[model samples]
Target: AALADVILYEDDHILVLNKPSGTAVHGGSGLSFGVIEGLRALRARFLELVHRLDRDTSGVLLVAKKRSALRSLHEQLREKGMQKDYLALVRGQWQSHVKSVQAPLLKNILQSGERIVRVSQEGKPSETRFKVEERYAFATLVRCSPVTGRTHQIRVHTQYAGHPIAFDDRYGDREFDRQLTEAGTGLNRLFLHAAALKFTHPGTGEVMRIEAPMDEGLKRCLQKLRNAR
Candidate 1:
């Protein structure tokens, strides 16, 4: 299939795109096609990802057209001038409205060649601030903003905070997984989504903000959890 829809913001500079969950940014190593590949196939001019979002996480993804734009954007991201916001459903309610999870993360490679992240003093510095958007009996709707964009930083920090994301197979309770599975409420897929992004335009020097709404599946899950609560 061709590229879905390109949310054009600037000419030959930057673009804000709504990335679909399960689609990779680029194709490589046995994958046939990704969003970049499809965009290229459609003859998108000078487009390249300035940053990355995980495959399961969907939201406002950014792309730059020119190398100069890419360099400028990268600088902004490195300087923490860009802000990313995410919406997630976690396993427990926060006793408070807002909290920060400050934890260092170490990446370890498992025997199966899978990379896992854990909290360790030997790891990189990571910090995330989570605000409770809404509360349910068994879960909480959260708005998370990360100060450091470490890989899986929000996921690991949330887990470390003792409220693993709903349906998260990694860093979650196996008993909950089994119970949900038996009850036909299994959420094997990670229930995390990047909802918004804010950054200054590299070329125009204007602030650019983009947001992606939750999909139907996630909305339904939220509704179900709310009703259950």
Candidate 2:
């Protein structure tokens, strides 16, 4: 069913795809094939990515069939007309239903050859609006809507709010990671998913929305969380 995981919602000018976690949008460095590569092999035409999601972040990915459509979609994204939503399992329960985390994010290269993002006044402006969907004893299910798209914006902003994501290694709790790893109750990928997307169609000018369902791994984790409490 690996091939079935790539669902395509397409029109004459664009395609909306639900990309799985761990699949890169495009190949880089030592990698030679990715989602785009496979799509090209099937369609025999170049497709342009309208926006980017991290390799471990799964959900809506847009592709433009032609250069003009790509340019127009990019312009709409820049104008803040596009809406992206994510579902995440963070470390703690937030006291409020809706809360806004506004912090400037700075990306830093660590000595371990890994990059870390943190909040700093000198960094670029970033904002994430979060709502607590469900609360458990130790964790909370959260829905986040990012106002400004920045690298690691949701992950870092959640950490800034004192609730690092459940399986996030870079900006999370190492003790919890080790504990969960020992128990085989941890995820190899970050516990963040691009759950829903809303944007205006480049050709039709109509509003479009796409959603990605939770994978088996995420479902299992949530089940365990429910059992624990």
Candidate 3:
């Protein structure tokens, strides 16, 4: 029942879904099955994920129904023609002038044989733009658009700026997040959401702007913060 509800939009060539958190995008590394596998069972057609979002950051997940469409979309990403937007609740008040973070990123670290990523000098160039949305007593709502798709780019950059996203265990203030949750602002997962995605329809020249609504739990968490404040 829940998997069927994940589909947001679909066409003969493309399918977009509101991917729920805590589910892998595909089967790999350790997982037995995920969104792709589930969809394959349901649709029994040629479907592939056009792009990927981290398992913890849920929202507008793009899937391609055809192989040609996948190639066309890949070209757009290579040319930097696609725009991906996100919404995140961070742990500190961010300045409006802090519009962008351009730094190199390093990833796929073999720490205890587990992959990890970080912002460092000896890495591929990465950039992300951010704007302050709303201010809370202890957190700030932020909008992020990444120009480069480096692993954990936004998370690392935000941490570099000294204000990590709330509930982000990888690049976050764990003690601070834990305190907030214990204080009643319930948050069970990372506070980042892939809210919007912008790109053109391959070979059609039509603009496709898709948005994913915030998860109900996150929305309630924000409201609880407001009440607490």
Candidate 4:
């Protein structure tokens, strides 16, 4: 696939791509090629990533073409100048009173060789704002804005609030996903997406916002839910 087709914005200093689900940002862990490697080969340029997204989370990902651009973008991230928003489909009807979730998260590795993050008093403080967009019979679509970028922050926070994200096998309810599949929703992947990203233009000093379009499969799944009771 031509990675350029997924590019939302590109300039002399930077490139923004609407990354597809299930692709690594960079090559590692037995993989020979990834988004960055593929792009480097295609464009034959020394491209560097400004930020990263989880493999299963599809959304706006930034890459810097120049060293100065990368430095400036990384500074923006450190100073909290970057604003990110995500869309998550979760189980159960979310309470209107719950506008946000603040919980401490600690990462742990289990004996089974699986990594998990959980809410604990000894963990780092994390916050995630939630806005209900749509409600289905047994599911709800929510807009999530994470104030703190912890690993799997959205997934852990949603699970802590008793509404794990749909199809999130790492921290979700399997029965919920089975229900969705049996309902003919065709959602077989994690129902979380990095919907929007806002940042400053490193080179021009202007503000820029990038929005990612949801894949057809996700759109179809949501439509089915909307059409249901």
Whole-model lDDT, model 3: 0.84
TM-score of each: 0.85, 0.87, 0.92, 0.91
Best by TM-score: 3
Ranking by TM-score: 3, 4, 2, 1
> Which regions in candidate 4 have their CA more than 4 angstroms from the true location?
1-4, 43-45, 108-115
**Candidate 3 steric clashes:** 0
Name the regions of candidate 1 deviating beyond 4 angstroms: 1-11, 28-32, 109-114, 177-188
lDDT of 2 at 193: 87
Candidate 2: residue 29 Cα off by (Å): 3.3
Tell me which of candidates 1 and 2 scores higher on TM-score: 2
Measured over all alpha carbons after superposition, the RMSD of each candidate to the real structure, in angstroms, is 3.0, 2.6, 2.0, 2.3
Error of 3 at 9 (Å): 0.6
**Candidate 1, 1-229: lDDT as tens digits:** 3244445344667777877777777765563677778778888368888887766777788888788889988898889998899998787676584489889999876765445799998889888988899886667889889888887788889889888876666677666545444534434466788888888887778887888776667776677666664
Model 4 TM-score on a 0 to 1 scale: 0.91
> In model 4, what are the clashing residue pairs, if there are any?
none
Error of 3 at 175 (Å): 2.2
Per-residue lDDT over 24-67 for candidate 3, one digit per residue giving the tens place of the 0 to 100 score = 78765653778889889985578888888887889999988888
Clashes of each: 0, 0, 0, 0
For model 1, name the residue pairs that clash: none
The sequence of per-residue lDDT tens digits that candidate 2 reaches over residues 29-121 is: 553567787788886575888887777888888888988789888888888888899998888677694489889999876654345788999
